[PDB]
Amino acid sequence: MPSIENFLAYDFWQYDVIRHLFAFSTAVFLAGLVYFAMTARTTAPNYRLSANISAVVMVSAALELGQLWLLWNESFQWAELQGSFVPVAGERFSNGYRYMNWLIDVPMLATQLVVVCGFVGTELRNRWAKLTIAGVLMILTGYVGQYFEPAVAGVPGYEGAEQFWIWGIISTAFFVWMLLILANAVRNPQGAPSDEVRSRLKFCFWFLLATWSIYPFAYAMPLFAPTADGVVVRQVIYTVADVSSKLVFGVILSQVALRRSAEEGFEPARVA
Ligand SMILES: CCCCCCCCCCCCO[C@@H]1O[C@H](CO)[C@@H](O[C@H]2O[C@H](CO)[C@@H](O)[C@H](O)[C@H]2O)[C@H](O)[C@H]1O
Ligand SMILES: CCCCCCCCCCCCO[C@@H]1O[C@H](CO)[C@@H](O[C@H]2O[C@H](CO)[C@@H](O)[C@H](O)[C@H]2O)[C@H](O)[C@H]1O
Ligand SMILES: *C\C=C(C)/C=C/C=C(C)/C=C/C1=C(C)CCCC1(C)C
């Protein structure tokens, strides 16, 4: 079933704000790719994997928000006689472009926190394995559940609303599992860090937990407000969540990684 954004007319400001957000997010991810590519060799080789993974994530999200911007521009046209941005015949906007590209974004964002946490070798591969399974089995189940928003909103002709509150509470259980795997990864760092680095890693985990909880709130948006205003607020708290959980988290984790590298022995990290 299509998105709830295809059953709502928009004002000029309502359409313009959403397309400005889609342009701004892909611009800031394209800039963050340049940033994480430039300042990648300033960290030690043992935490440079987390620096390369950040650039991989910036590749992944700029190739998601650009497609969302393209599909937002194609699926709607201006109707002058109503003063509205009505849809077009033939094209329908989809919010699954987010969920398809989160499958690379979420396990790498958790893995790069485990890397700065100091887990190497078999332990890194074993904590990546659990996190990838738990983040594939939650993102795909959210992707099934987000196909029932015309049903859960109340659009006539689109039934089957019971499958919206099932594949969200299913994806919640694996999200709790991911938070647990990251929690006992940040409670026991490896490599004997300092008491400031431990607080920074705990702050990294709590920041990830706070910026990842916005996504179940934006998921339930066509149950709270299935209106164009609700769609605008949903895209605002999607842009804020995207930037906070991928670029801001990357800059905070690179600061913790540089602190660890400059603490152990790295002169490029000490002079920076
Ligand atoms: C969108 C345009 C481009 C945006 C670019 C900017 C991205 C963000 C830059 C980094 C800013 C945040 O940087 C982060 O700040 C918090 C502020 O509480 C610091 O955190 C500090 O306070 C917290 C309070 O809970 C303590 O737990 C922590 O031990 C302490 O260091 C982090 O050590 C620092 O890494
Ligand atoms: C536009 C998308 C990309 C934006 C990224 C740029 C960050 C701009 C916001 C800066 C926030 C202030 O917080 C500050 O962050 C920078 C960058 O992490 C940290 O800077 C640290 O790493 C940089 C990069 O290797 C070094 O040049 C610097 O000497 C070092 O201290 C500071 O220790 C911290 O105090
Ligand atoms: C942009 C990268 C990030 C941080 C993506 C994260 C996505 C989630 C944490 C989503 C979680 C969901 C839950 C727990 C509820 C069901 C639907 C979602 C998939 C949105």
Residue numbers in the entry: 1 to 245, 246A, 247 to 272
What does the paper say about this structure?
We demonstrate the capabilities of our method by studying the dynamics of the rhodopsin ErNaR (Erythrobacter sp. ErNaR belongs to a recently identified subgroup of the NDQ rhodopsins, which feature an additional glutamic acid residue close to the retinal Schiff base, allowing ErNaR to efficiently pump sodium ions even at acidic pH. Samples of ErNaR are activated with a nanosecond laser pulse of 532 nm wavelength (6 ns FWHM pulse duration, 6.4 mJ/cm2 fluence) and jet vitrified at 107 μs and 13.3 ms, to probe the K2 and O2 states, respectively.
We remove monomers that are not undergoing the photocycle with 3D classification, which then allows us to obtain a 2.8 Å and 3.3 Å reconstruction for the K2 and O2 state, respectively, and build molecular models. At 107 μs after photoactivation, we observe the K2 state. Moreover, in the adjacent active center, a disruption of the tight hydrogen bond network occurs that characterizes the dark state. This network, which includes Lys246 to which the retinal cofactor is covalently bound, is believed to prevent transport through the channel. In particular, the densities for the side chains of Glu64 and Asp105 suggest increased flexibility. Here, this hydrogen bond appears to have been disrupted, along with the hydrogen bond between the retinal Schiff base and Asp105. Moreover, the density for the water molecule that is coordinated by Glu64 and Asp242 in the dark state is absent. We propose that these conformational changes are related to priming of the active center for the translocation of sodium.
